[PDB]
Amino acid sequence: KKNSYSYGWSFYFGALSFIIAEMVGVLAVHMFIDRHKQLT
């Protein structure tokens, strides 16, 4: 106990990549629904 292990560097690049990938995936659906609403 009291080892003070650190989650450190580029592990956070995975956590950042999650947010970036999810912000990608939501915008795709905006493009879908807007692109389909154009042909309505």
SS3 6: coil
Sequence-ordered strand ranges (E) for 1-40: none
Experimental method: cryo-EM
Resolution in A: 4.2
Distances (CA, A) of 24 to 13, 17, 18, 33: 16, 10, 10, 15
Amino acid at 10: S
Residues 22 and 29: their CA atoms lie apart, in Å, by: 11
Which whole-number Å values give the CA distances from 39 to 7, 20, 30, in the listed order?
A: 49, 29, 14
Residue 2 CA, chain-centre distance (Å), reads 33
Task: Report the first-to-last Cα separation within the chain, whole angstroms.
Answer: 63
Q: 29: which 2 tokens? A: 């659906």
Q: How far apart are CA 27 and CA 1, in angstroms?
A: 45
